[PDB]
Amino acid sequence: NEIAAQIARQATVRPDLSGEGEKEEPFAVVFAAMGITQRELSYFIQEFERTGALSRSVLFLNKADDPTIERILTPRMALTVAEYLAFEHDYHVLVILTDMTNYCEALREIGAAREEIPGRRGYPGYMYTDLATIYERAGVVEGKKGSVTQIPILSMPDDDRTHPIPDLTGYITEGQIQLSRELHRKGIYPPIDPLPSLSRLMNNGVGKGKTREDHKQVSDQLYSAYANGVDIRKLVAIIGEDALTENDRRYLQFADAFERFFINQGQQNRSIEESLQIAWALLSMLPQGELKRISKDHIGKYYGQKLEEI
Amino acid sequence: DRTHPIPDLTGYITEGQIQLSRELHRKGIYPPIDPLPSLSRLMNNGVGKGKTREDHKQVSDQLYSAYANGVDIRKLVAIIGEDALTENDRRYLQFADAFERFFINQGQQNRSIEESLQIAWALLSMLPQGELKRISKDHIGKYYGQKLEEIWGAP
Amino acid sequence: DRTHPIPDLTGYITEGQIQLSRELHRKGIYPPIDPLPSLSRLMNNGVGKGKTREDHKQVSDQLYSAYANGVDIRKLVAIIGEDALTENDRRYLQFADAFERFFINQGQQNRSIEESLQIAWALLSMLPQGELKRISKDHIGKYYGQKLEEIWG
Amino acid sequence: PGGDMSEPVTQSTLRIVGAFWRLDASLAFRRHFPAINWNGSYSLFTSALDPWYRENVAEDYPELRDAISELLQREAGLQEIVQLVGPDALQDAERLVIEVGRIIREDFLQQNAYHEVDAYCSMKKAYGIMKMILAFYKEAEAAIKRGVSIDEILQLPVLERIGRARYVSEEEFPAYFEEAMKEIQGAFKALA
Amino acid sequence: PGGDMSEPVTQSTLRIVGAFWRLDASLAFRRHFPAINWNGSYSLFTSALDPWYRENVAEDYPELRDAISELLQREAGLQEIVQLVGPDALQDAERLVIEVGRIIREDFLQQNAYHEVDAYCSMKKAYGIMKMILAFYKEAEAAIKRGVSIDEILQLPVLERIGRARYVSEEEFPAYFEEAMKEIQGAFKALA
Amino acid sequence: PGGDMSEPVTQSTLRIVGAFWRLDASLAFRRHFPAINWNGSYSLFTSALDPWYRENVAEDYPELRDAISELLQREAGLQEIVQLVGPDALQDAERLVIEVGRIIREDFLQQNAYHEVDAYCSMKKAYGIMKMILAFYKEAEAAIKRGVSIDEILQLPVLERIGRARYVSEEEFPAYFEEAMKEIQGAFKALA
Amino acid sequence: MAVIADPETAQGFRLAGLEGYGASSAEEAQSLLETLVERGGYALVAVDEALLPDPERAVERLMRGRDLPVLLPIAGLKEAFQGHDVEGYMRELVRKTIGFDIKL
Amino acid sequence: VSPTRMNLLQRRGQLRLAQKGVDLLKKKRDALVAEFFGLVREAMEARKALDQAAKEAYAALLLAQAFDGPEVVAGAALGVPPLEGVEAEVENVWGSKVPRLKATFPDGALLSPVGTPAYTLEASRAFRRYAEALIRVANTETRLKKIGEEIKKTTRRVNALEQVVIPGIRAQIRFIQQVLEQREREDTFRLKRIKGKIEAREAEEE
């Protein structure tokens, strides 16, 4: 919930860094709640109110004690409003769905009421089709300026990625962001685990006229270095030896500093320039002896920062 | 399997359980009642001063702890060997063995609660005095000291 | 899955089965018949003196025992490491892998029963003579001793 | 179906049978027959049959059988540690128990249904085999306590005598049994 | 659903298809693409295509493929021993097998569909990469038998040539492969 | 069913409840009451209730409570080391944190519900106890950094003062807390 | 046995009839120690701490499966007269063999 | 693996056996740690004794070199037969064999005790007892390192179990439970269908 609220507060178009520098096109956030309790509802209301984001938002809120059919109808209403705004008034709409787990539970209840054929864990056999009919309404239409972006937050039951809910959602959506319970145990916020995370549409949204020319290379190098650090530290618990090659100890330090500075950012609204700067500063590895998975010459332009913050 | 619906619901409704042990039975011990998994949820009310005896609950707790220690030491002595254990661990070994031989392996005998308490104190005497933490010093001074003769040597 | 209803009922109806092993197939062994789950119930009718040879059944039983011991020692090695084995366990491990590489892996060639029996005896010669507890003494005296390198160069 | 012993027919049978001889595929694959799962089998007639055993086999037959079952239970208990750390890490007494259990499984419980001799086994023959096995076990344990190496014990030819005992015909068995008992005593007195 | 290959659609599909390219989620989580589980996959057309491979790629192409597959098999086998004992406490030949397997993976199996060159690979480019890797493996094996420590072997500059081989275009690949062969020979000749 | 927090009722309950007090029987076995497990238990009302604490009990209550939580977390994180090797063999500062964790467990988390005074504890009384404990910890850290022995700290007269602090009546608590703060300050000033 | 230290220490150990080698640099000492191990007749090799602080880097190249010629570091006489760091040596040993720096 | 109720019970039994194995290995590790901490103190005492022996042997050598020529002590060193009467019995510790050194150290290697210089006997005896102290120290060090290796192996086993085996068995068990629940649910659905069809065919046929 905190991540959803923070994204709703901080998400902005950033049109200046785009090639087509202009005044901001209208941006709105449609927030849909499904099976939400009073406490989380109060949290969301206060979070939207204290920052002025409530002005550019339409909230569809469905409490836990509401009829079980309102949970079914809430995402439909939210997406209908978002589609209308985007494709008839050029609004750039970001849609946040509070908990699709509650929606799937309500759908299971309705299906069991109708006595249909069950699925993997009692869910109706058409759950994929219904979730697709919700999710697929996002996108951009040729010849129109508006856009619809969806961030469905859902809870993995027992952190099981093979559960029907996350499985079908991943089958329908383009990538996913995964929260790590261990990173939460270490006090890191947001506890986003980059190794099991993926964005299918990332590769064509970064580059020249979009973010910065070093974005893709930096992301690839960060993934390579963090994976190397994670695998070294996972082997150390097996070998049980802190004594190893000198280069491995560089990555362990890099991995720890990464998890403590890049991922652990609290409530900071880091700009993409600031995030890239922090990535570059964390890039304390060898300019050539390391950082070789992606061949880039932006090293001579950006490398050499000394972990300085603010 | 205790996960079966019948034992599960019985545990939901009843107050504790008494679990027979297959390995105790196949070792020739009768009755094959395993003390570690067995449990009475109302035991604390029906025993004590004026009901059975003052030392009943403490003696039972001490026997449970000592038997658990003896069992795990029997497991460990298989790999690390007899001599690698301290003296008190050998005492726990002997206590657990004599416990399974005399306390559990009762046979067709009808033991009054006094006889069972006396046998329990005889077994607890094998452990060193003062190691018996769960029992108050008064009960130890009053009862600790006897030796195993009621079941063997003088039935 | 051997517990699936189709193979389950077929096994309950037919006289044993020739079960193929995917592991042997991945090792390049053809035909990948792992003998442990296989079975022929009418084997005893067709083997023995005057039918194939006097030593056939005992040789088969000894081969099964040795292969099963080798598999168990493989599972042990998967935990405690190869160098932790005794000499007998090393001998059984070698018997197991040589078995899989020579007795099973025969390719598309045709072997007579006599050829297969002498190959089996050459494999059994890898084990100590006193440990072939399922084979009679006369058969051991008659056939034990030959080596794999004798069969082919 | 599929060997699933939790199947309703098997469960319904468990509640009315006086004995339950459970076969398992693990022994059948090894060609170890009768492939009776000792751990999963039981019989409720042991107590009622003891007077007949005392009258018609030997006065000490129930004690001998109980000792055999206790050794089997101990070997089953030790197998948990064996599968955890291997057989070498066990002490001499524990590995001796494991080896005695292996000897029992191989040359007392095994029975070839087609062998002209082993197919049938009279009660006194089984008693003789059990007595030989436990006498060897007691002498081997005494030797272990006095410092004889366990692998030294395992090389005794009288072990092969015990192993081949089950192939002896019924007519000539008592001479074989007396010879093997004398050999046990002599071997563990000379070899201590 | 959930990667369960036991579901009816997958099983009913496997009964008719001639090739089975099984994907793995573990590889895709590590950005290791194509993420083909080279152990669980299979193809029934390998035997029938061998004459075409001989006549249109190279006379010895099937042998190259067989050797690469066997190296992958040995690497997969040794992975468990690495996880159990630790990579440090195993022989130098097994370390060479592990490193050659990792090189094979990350330089031949791995393929970026979005890179403008690595996306498409003709048969002869793959054959050249396989030849490079096997020549390096045999030279490193000879050097190991020559007493050369694997620590400096892993540091050879030829590894970067092998790793960047897959990013070379079709036009430049012949000269790159020839100079890579010469470098493979000469670098290990410089070990002496 | 068996303490398994994964069964559907527990999952459904924990998705809406504002707090979870994972009661444990291990602590009550050790005569620790109220036997609440600080690990695996959580509350979501601390944040919104912080202003109420600041206005009603003390401005510095949330910081002190977070200090308690951090010390408990450190003690839990050192449990594997203190279990592999005894606390006596443990390092001096680690021994200090272990002892202060024990002090917390025995004088703040403990509560005798059968007592005439301690059965109920006001927020101000808890604040005073926690402030005394943190004063002790900071003074002990300062003393250790300047070369005192751990057993010297383990026997100061202020320890029993903090122990008896929770048995004082509500009206006697303020003066007792003030005098115990003065006692701890003067005592740790006396130590070199 | 054998001792590999400065020539003075080697001569002093020769006074006991023990093999001695005089080496002033680590690489020469390691090279000659390899030949001594290849000889393998002696059951113990003692090396100067100031010469080879970590002879473990050189023991493992030979005698891979066999440990009869066991070797330990010893303080050279030149610094032995000054004094030896026994407690730091034991602490670094327990770190090398356990890895928790658990002392006192 | 085959999802069946019997197989599920087998997996649960394997999990409990694995947990008991983890606990047993932890007990073994604690015992080995106690033995190791006894042996480290013993080896420290041996180290101190070796330090004193080395100090006095060095002082004795310096006295001999001051009061006796280098050529003379060189001849004394050459004349004395080498003390090669050494061996290492295969001591058995915790199931592992280690070499336990022991020295014969004959006194027949001495030549002319009163014919030697004034400070030759002192240096020789100091170096001899220094050598035997060194042998004792080597024994302590090798035993300590073997115990440390055993402890590291036990920790490897415990960590491997708790980290990859128990979670794996738990995942297998939960997968099997899900499969069995799915089969039960499908059976329930079919039972409902047949009961409904009985009601329909009995009602419509009347």
PDB file of N, CA, C and O in Angstrom, chain A residues 149-188:
ATOM      1  N   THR A 149      -2.283   3.558 -18.124  1.00  0.00           N
ATOM      2  CA  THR A 149      -1.257   2.737 -17.503  1.00  0.00           C
ATOM      3  C   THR A 149      -1.823   2.106 -16.242  1.00  0.00           C
ATOM      4  O   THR A 149      -2.462   2.785 -15.434  1.00  0.00           O
ATOM      5  N   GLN A 150      -1.589   0.810 -16.072  1.00  0.00           N
ATOM      6  CA  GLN A 150      -2.165   0.055 -14.971  1.00  0.00           C
ATOM      7  C   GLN A 150      -1.063  -0.502 -14.088  1.00  0.00           C
ATOM      8  O   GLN A 150      -0.068  -1.031 -14.590  1.00  0.00           O
ATOM      9  N   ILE A 151      -1.243  -0.379 -12.779  1.00  0.00           N
ATOM     10  CA  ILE A 151      -0.348  -1.001 -11.808  1.00  0.00           C
ATOM     11  C   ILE A 151      -1.204  -1.810 -10.844  1.00  0.00           C
ATOM     12  O   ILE A 151      -1.584  -1.301  -9.781  1.00  0.00           O
ATOM     13  N   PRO A 152      -1.565  -3.049 -11.179  1.00  0.00           N
ATOM     14  CA  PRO A 152      -2.379  -3.859 -10.265  1.00  0.00           C
ATOM     15  C   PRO A 152      -1.518  -4.413  -9.141  1.00  0.00           C
ATOM     16  O   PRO A 152      -0.618  -5.220  -9.378  1.00  0.00           O
ATOM     17  N   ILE A 153      -1.791  -3.979  -7.918  1.00  0.00           N
ATOM     18  CA  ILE A 153      -1.133  -4.533  -6.743  1.00  0.00           C
ATOM     19  C   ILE A 153      -1.911  -5.753  -6.282  1.00  0.00           C
ATOM     20  O   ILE A 153      -3.138  -5.703  -6.146  1.00  0.00           O
ATOM     21  N   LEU A 154      -1.202  -6.855  -6.054  1.00  0.00           N
ATOM     22  CA  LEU A 154      -1.828  -8.082  -5.593  1.00  0.00           C
ATOM     23  C   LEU A 154      -0.924  -8.753  -4.572  1.00  0.00           C
ATOM     24  O   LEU A 154       0.294  -8.563  -4.577  1.00  0.00           O
ATOM     25  N   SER A 155      -1.535  -9.549  -3.702  1.00  0.00           N
ATOM     26  CA  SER A 155      -0.830 -10.227  -2.622  1.00  0.00           C
ATOM     27  C   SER A 155      -0.677 -11.698  -2.983  1.00  0.00           C
ATOM     28  O   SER A 155      -1.667 -12.383  -3.255  1.00  0.00           O
ATOM     29  N   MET A 156       0.554 -12.179  -2.985  1.00  0.00           N
ATOM     30  CA  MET A 156       0.802 -13.587  -3.253  1.00  0.00           C
ATOM     31  C   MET A 156       0.432 -14.409  -2.027  1.00  0.00           C
ATOM     32  O   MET A 156       0.999 -14.185  -0.951  1.00  0.00           O
ATOM     33  N   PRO A 157      -0.496 -15.360  -2.134  1.00  0.00           N
ATOM     34  CA  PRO A 157      -0.849 -16.190  -0.973  1.00  0.00           C
ATOM     35  C   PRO A 157       0.320 -17.077  -0.575  1.00  0.00           C
ATOM     36  O   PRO A 157       0.783 -17.904  -1.363  1.00  0.00           O
ATOM     37  N   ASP A 158       0.800 -16.894   0.656  1.00  0.00           N
ATOM     38  CA  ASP A 158       1.960 -17.617   1.174  1.00  0.00           C
ATOM     39  C   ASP A 158       3.198 -17.383   0.315  1.00  0.00           C
ATOM     40  O   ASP A 158       4.083 -18.239   0.244  1.00  0.00           O
ATOM     41  N   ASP A 159       3.264 -16.221  -0.334  1.00  0.00           N
ATOM     42  CA  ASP A 159       4.380 -15.854  -1.205  1.00  0.00           C
ATOM     43  C   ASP A 159       4.600 -16.885  -2.305  1.00  0.00           C
ATOM     44  O   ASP A 159       5.731 -17.126  -2.729  1.00  0.00           O
ATOM     45  N   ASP A 160       3.520 -17.493  -2.783  1.00  0.00           N
ATOM     46  CA  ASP A 160       3.591 -18.548  -3.785  1.00  0.00           C
ATOM     47  C   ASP A 160       3.390 -17.922  -5.156  1.00  0.00           C
ATOM     48  O   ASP A 160       2.279 -17.510  -5.502  1.00  0.00           O
ATOM     49  N   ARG A 161       4.467 -17.849  -5.938  1.00  0.00           N
ATOM     50  CA  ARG A 161       4.364 -17.319  -7.291  1.00  0.00           C
ATOM     51  C   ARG A 161       3.625 -18.271  -8.220  1.00  0.00           C
ATOM     52  O   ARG A 161       3.161 -17.846  -9.282  1.00  0.00           O
ATOM     53  N   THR A 162       3.488 -19.535  -7.840  1.00  0.00           N
ATOM     54  CA  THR A 162       2.766 -20.517  -8.637  1.00  0.00           C
ATOM     55  C   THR A 162       1.285 -20.578  -8.298  1.00  0.00           C
ATOM     56  O   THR A 162       0.569 -21.410  -8.861  1.00  0.00           O
ATOM     57  N   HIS A 163       0.816 -19.729  -7.392  1.00  0.00           N
ATOM     58  CA  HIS A 163      -0.602 -19.650  -7.094  1.00  0.00           C
ATOM     59  C   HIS A 163      -1.350 -19.146  -8.327  1.00  0.00           C
ATOM     60  O   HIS A 163      -0.776 -18.441  -9.159  1.00  0.00           O
ATOM     61  N   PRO A 164      -2.623 -19.516  -8.491  1.00  0.00           N
ATOM     62  CA  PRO A 164      -3.354 -19.079  -9.690  1.00  0.00           C
ATOM     63  C   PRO A 164      -3.366 -17.577  -9.915  1.00  0.00           C
ATOM     64  O   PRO A 164      -3.258 -17.138 -11.066  1.00  0.00           O
ATOM     65  N   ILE A 165      -3.478 -16.776  -8.861  1.00  0.00           N
ATOM     66  CA  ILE A 165      -3.609 -15.329  -9.022  1.00  0.00           C
ATOM     67  C   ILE A 165      -2.347 -14.773  -9.676  1.00  0.00           C
ATOM     68  O   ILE A 165      -2.437 -14.224 -10.787  1.00  0.00           O
ATOM     69  N   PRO A 166      -1.165 -14.870  -9.050  1.00  0.00           N
ATOM     70  CA  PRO A 166       0.024 -14.319  -9.708  1.00  0.00           C
ATOM     71  C   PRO A 166       0.335 -14.995 -11.020  1.00  0.00           C
ATOM     72  O   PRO A 166       0.833 -14.336 -11.937  1.00  0.00           O
ATOM     73  N   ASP A 167       0.040 -16.289 -11.150  1.00  0.00           N
ATOM     74  CA  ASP A 167       0.353 -16.993 -12.387  1.00  0.00           C
ATOM     75  C   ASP A 167      -0.422 -16.406 -13.559  1.00  0.00           C
ATOM     76  O   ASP A 167       0.163 -16.022 -14.578  1.00  0.00           O
ATOM     77  N   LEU A 168      -1.743 -16.296 -13.417  1.00  0.00           N
ATOM     78  CA  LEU A 168      -2.541 -15.738 -14.501  1.00  0.00           C
ATOM     79  C   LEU A 168      -2.227 -14.265 -14.717  1.00  0.00           C
ATOM     80  O   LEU A 168      -2.171 -13.798 -15.863  1.00  0.00           O
ATOM     81  N   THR A 169      -2.004 -13.513 -13.636  1.00  0.00           N
ATOM     82  CA  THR A 169      -1.686 -12.101 -13.801  1.00  0.00           C
ATOM     83  C   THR A 169      -0.400 -11.915 -14.593  1.00  0.00           C
ATOM     84  O   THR A 169      -0.328 -11.057 -15.479  1.00  0.00           O
ATOM     85  N   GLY A 170       0.623 -12.715 -14.296  1.00  0.00           N
ATOM     86  CA  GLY A 170       1.845 -12.652 -15.077  1.00  0.00           C
ATOM     87  C   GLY A 170       1.637 -13.108 -16.505  1.00  0.00           C
ATOM     88  O   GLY A 170       2.273 -12.594 -17.428  1.00  0.00           O
ATOM     89  N   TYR A 171       0.751 -14.084 -16.707  1.00  0.00           N
ATOM     90  CA  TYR A 171       0.430 -14.505 -18.063  1.00  0.00           C
ATOM     91  C   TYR A 171      -0.219 -13.397 -18.872  1.00  0.00           C
ATOM     92  O   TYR A 171      -0.059 -13.367 -20.096  1.00  0.00           O
ATOM     93  N   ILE A 172      -0.948 -12.494 -18.230  1.00  0.00           N
ATOM     94  CA  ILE A 172      -1.666 -11.438 -18.936  1.00  0.00           C
ATOM     95  C   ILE A 172      -0.848 -10.158 -19.032  1.00  0.00           C
ATOM     96  O   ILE A 172      -0.798  -9.525 -20.085  1.00  0.00           O
ATOM     97  N   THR A 173      -0.202  -9.755 -17.947  1.00  0.00           N
ATOM     98  CA  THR A 173       0.472  -8.467 -17.925  1.00  0.00           C
ATOM     99  C   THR A 173       1.857  -8.557 -18.558  1.00  0.00           C
ATOM    100  O   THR A 173       2.365  -9.639 -18.856  1.00  0.00           O
ATOM    101  N   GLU A 174       2.467  -7.388 -18.767  1.00  0.00           N
ATOM    102  CA  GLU A 174       3.816  -7.309 -19.331  1.00  0.00           C
ATOM    103  C   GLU A 174       4.824  -7.088 -18.204  1.00  0.00           C
ATOM    104  O   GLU A 174       5.157  -5.966 -17.827  1.00  0.00           O
ATOM    105  N   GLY A 175       5.310  -8.191 -17.670  1.00  0.00           N
ATOM    106  CA  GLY A 175       6.282  -8.156 -16.600  1.00  0.00           C
ATOM    107  C   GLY A 175       5.615  -7.923 -15.260  1.00  0.00           C
ATOM    108  O   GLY A 175       4.392  -7.832 -15.143  1.00  0.00           O
ATOM    109  N   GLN A 176       6.452  -7.830 -14.230  1.00  0.00           N
ATOM    110  CA  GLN A 176       5.949  -7.642 -12.879  1.00  0.00           C
ATOM    111  C   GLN A 176       7.063  -7.121 -11.987  1.00  0.00           C
ATOM    112  O   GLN A 176       8.247  -7.299 -12.279  1.00  0.00           O
ATOM    113  N   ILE A 177       6.661  -6.481 -10.895  1.00  0.00           N
ATOM    114  CA  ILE A 177       7.563  -6.039  -9.840  1.00  0.00           C
ATOM    115  C   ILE A 177       7.298  -6.917  -8.629  1.00  0.00           C
ATOM    116  O   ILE A 177       6.145  -7.073  -8.212  1.00  0.00           O
ATOM    117  N   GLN A 178       8.351  -7.495  -8.066  1.00  0.00           N
ATOM    118  CA  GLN A 178       8.214  -8.458  -6.982  1.00  0.00           C
ATOM    119  C   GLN A 178       8.830  -7.893  -5.712  1.00  0.00           C
ATOM    120  O   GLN A 178       9.991  -7.475  -5.715  1.00  0.00           O
ATOM    121  N   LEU A 179       8.052  -7.883  -4.635  1.00  0.00           N
ATOM    122  CA  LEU A 179       8.560  -7.472  -3.335  1.00  0.00           C
ATOM    123  C   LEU A 179       9.168  -8.663  -2.610  1.00  0.00           C
ATOM    124  O   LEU A 179       8.618  -9.767  -2.629  1.00  0.00           O
ATOM    125  N   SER A 180      10.306  -8.433  -1.964  1.00  0.00           N
ATOM    126  CA  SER A 180      11.042  -9.488  -1.283  1.00  0.00           C
ATOM    127  C   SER A 180      10.834  -9.376   0.219  1.00  0.00           C
ATOM    128  O   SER A 180      11.062  -8.313   0.805  1.00  0.00           O
ATOM    129  N   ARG A 181      10.403 -10.476   0.838  1.00  0.00           N
ATOM    130  CA  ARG A 181      10.208 -10.476   2.282  1.00  0.00           C
ATOM    131  C   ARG A 181      11.528 -10.330   3.025  1.00  0.00           C
ATOM    132  O   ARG A 181      11.579  -9.671   4.069  1.00  0.00           O
ATOM    133  N   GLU A 182      12.598 -10.933   2.510  1.00  0.00           N
ATOM    134  CA  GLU A 182      13.893 -10.802   3.168  1.00  0.00           C
ATOM    135  C   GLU A 182      14.368  -9.356   3.180  1.00  0.00           C
ATOM    136  O   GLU A 182      14.856  -8.869   4.206  1.00  0.00           O
ATOM    137  N   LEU A 183      14.232  -8.650   2.056  1.00  0.00           N
ATOM    138  CA  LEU A 183      14.642  -7.251   2.028  1.00  0.00           C
ATOM    139  C   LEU A 183      13.826  -6.419   3.001  1.00  0.00           C
ATOM    140  O   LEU A 183      14.336  -5.445   3.564  1.00  0.00           O
ATOM    141  N   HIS A 184      12.560  -6.779   3.208  1.00  0.00           N
ATOM    142  CA  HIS A 184      11.772  -6.120   4.242  1.00  0.00           C
ATOM    143  C   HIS A 184      12.319  -6.432   5.626  1.00  0.00           C
ATOM    144  O   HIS A 184      12.346  -5.559   6.501  1.00  0.00           O
ATOM    145  N   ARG A 185      12.757  -7.675   5.846  1.00  0.00           N
ATOM    146  CA  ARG A 185      13.333  -8.031   7.138  1.00  0.00           C
ATOM    147  C   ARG A 185      14.589  -7.225   7.432  1.00  0.00           C
ATOM    148  O   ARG A 185      14.868  -6.912   8.593  1.00  0.00           O
ATOM    149  N   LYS A 186      15.353  -6.873   6.403  1.00  0.00           N
ATOM    150  CA  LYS A 186      16.543  -6.055   6.584  1.00  0.00           C
ATOM    151  C   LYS A 186      16.227  -4.575   6.724  1.00  0.00           C
ATOM    152  O   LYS A 186      17.154  -3.764   6.784  1.00  0.00           O
ATOM    153  N   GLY A 187      14.951  -4.203   6.769  1.00  0.00           N
ATOM    154  CA  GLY A 187      14.583  -2.816   6.963  1.00  0.00           C
ATOM    155  C   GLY A 187      14.672  -1.947   5.733  1.00  0.00           C
ATOM    156  O   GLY A 187      14.678  -0.719   5.860  1.00  0.00           O
ATOM    157  N   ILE A 188      14.738  -2.535   4.548  1.00  0.00           N
ATOM    158  CA  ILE A 188      14.845  -1.777   3.308  1.00  0.00           C
ATOM    159  C   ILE A 188      13.449  -1.443   2.808  1.00  0.00           C
ATOM    160  O   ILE A 188      12.550  -2.290   2.838  1.00  0.00           O
TER     161      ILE A 188
END
